[PDB]
Design a protein around this nucleic acid. Structure first.
Ligand SMILES: [Ca+2]
Ligand code: NA
Ligand code: NA
Length: 327
DNA sequence: CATTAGA
DNA sequence: TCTAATG
C-alpha cells in the first residue's frame, strides 16, 4: 500500500504503456499480475532477487526493480515519458470516444493535437465529434449543488411521462459524494421484467421527454436499453450557462432493480465486501440477482427482491445507508 | 462483461 | 460479422 508503492507504480506505468502505445497485450498483462503480487507482499522489497522469488516475477521485471531501487528512476520510464509519439497517444485518448486504437491511427496520420483534431473533424465519427466538442466540460467534475438540480428535473419528466416509472440516481452522488463525474440514472418500470419481451419505447419515451424540454442536448448512443448522452442545466438568467454533462440512463427489468441499484451504488469495495459476505451466508450477488447457494459446489434459484433491504436481510446484514456504502 | 456504433 | 469504445 505504501511499502510497495513506487514498485507497483512504476509497474503499472509500464504495463499501461505497453497496452497503449504498444499493442503488447501480454507484456502488458505481465506487468500487471506482477504489480498485483508485489502489491500484496508484506515487506519492503529489497532487490530484484527478492521480488524475483515471486510469481509472475521474472527476470525482466526484476531487473527493472533493481534499477529503480538503485537510482530513483528508470530509463525506459524516462524515455516513454518524454516520447512524443507516445505522449500523443496518451492524450488523444482523453477525448471521449477515442480509444488507443484510434489514438494510434490518428497519430500516424499525424493528429497529435486537439487542434489537429479540429481541422480533421471529418475523420472523426459522431461520438468523437461530440467528444471533441465538449472536451472542456467533459473533463470537469459535477457539483452536488448541480447534481441536485439535475436529479430534480429528471425525476420530474419521468413522472410526467408515466407515473409508473421508478428512477434512481446512482453512483457517488447517491452515496453523498460532493461531486460526481457524470450522472447515472437507473430505470425500471413494472411492465418490464425478465420475461415480458421488451418495450423499447420504455426507454425511448423518456429520452424523448428529456430532449423535449432541452435537458438532453445530444446523443452519444441510444439503444433499446441504454441511452448515453450529454445534458445541460438551463443556463438561467444569463451571464452563467452550464457545462455540458455526461449522462446515461438504463432500462431495467423491474424484477432486477435493487440488485442492480445495489450494485451501481457501490462503492467498488462495499460491493466486493458485500459480495464476499452473501457467500458465507450461503448466497450469490451479481449486478442483477441474488441466488441461494447449493452445496454440490454451486447452485441457482433467484430470490425475490423489493428493496435494497431485502438483499440486506437475505444476507442478514445491517441495512447500510448509501452514505455509508463507502467500503 | 455487456451494450452500441460502425464499417 | 468483427472490432472498438463506454462503463
Ligand atoms: Ca458514474
Ligand atoms: Na519467480
Ligand atoms: Na477516450
Amino acid at each position: 500500500e505504501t511499502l510497495n508503492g513506487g514498485i507497483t507504480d512504476m509497474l503499472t506505468e509500464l504495463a499501461n504503456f505497453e497496452k497503449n502505445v504498444s499493442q503488447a497485450i501480454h507484456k502488458y498483462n505481465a506487468y500487471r499480475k506482477a504489480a498485483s503480487v508485489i502489491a500484496k507482499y508484506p515487506h519492503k522489497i529489497k532487490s530484484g532477487a527478492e521480488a524475483k522469488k515471486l510469481p509472475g516475477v521474472g527476470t525482466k521485471i526484476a531487473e527493472k526493480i533493481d534499477e529503480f531501487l538503485a537510482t530513483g528512476k528508470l530509463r525506459k520510464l524516462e524515455k516513454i515519458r518524454q516520447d512524443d509519439t507516445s505522449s500523443s497517444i496518451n492524450f488523444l485518448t482523453r477525448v471521449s470516444g477515442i480509444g488507443p486504437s484510434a489514438a494510434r491511427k490518428f497519430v500516424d496520420e499525424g493528429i497529435k493535437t486537439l487542434e489537429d483534431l479540429r481541422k480533421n473533424e471529418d475523420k472523426l465519427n459522431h461520438h468523437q465529434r461530440i467528444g471533441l466538442k465538449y472536451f472542456g466540460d467533459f473533463e470537469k467534475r459535477i457539483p452536488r449543488e448541480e447534481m441536485l438540480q439535475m436529479q430534480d428535473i429528471v425525476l420530474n419528466e419521468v413522472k410526467k411521462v408515466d407515473s409508473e416509472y421508478i428512477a434512481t440516481v446512482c453512483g457517488s452522488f447517491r452515496r453523498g459524494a460532493e461531486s460526481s463525474g457524470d450522472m447515472d440514472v437507473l430505470l425500471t418500470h413494472p411492465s418490464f421484467t425478465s420475461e415480458s419481451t421488451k418495450q423499447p419505447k420504455l426507454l425511448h419515451q423518456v429520452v424523448e421527454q428529456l430532449q423535449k424540454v432541452h435537458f438532453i442536448t445530444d446523443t452519444l448512443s441510444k439503444g433499446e436499453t441504454k441511452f448515453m448522452g450529454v445534458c445541460q442545466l438551463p443556463s438561467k438568467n444569463d451571464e452563467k450557462e452550464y457545462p455540458h454533462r455526461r449522462i446515461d440512463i438504463r432500462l431495467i427489468p423491474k424484477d432486477q432493480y435493487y440488485c442492480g441499484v445495489l450494485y451501481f451504488t457501490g462503492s467498488d469495495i462495499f460491493n466486493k465486501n458485500m459480495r464476499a459476505h452473501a457467500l458465507e451466508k450461503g448466497f450469490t450477488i451479481n449486478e442483477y440477482t441474488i441466488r441461494p447457494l447449493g452445496v454440490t459446489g454451486v447452485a441457482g434459484e433467484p430470490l425475490p427482491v423489493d428493496s435494497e433491504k431485502d438483499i440486506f436481510d437475505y444476507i442478514q446484514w445491517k441495512y447500510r445507508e448509501p452514505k455509508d456504502r463507502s467500503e
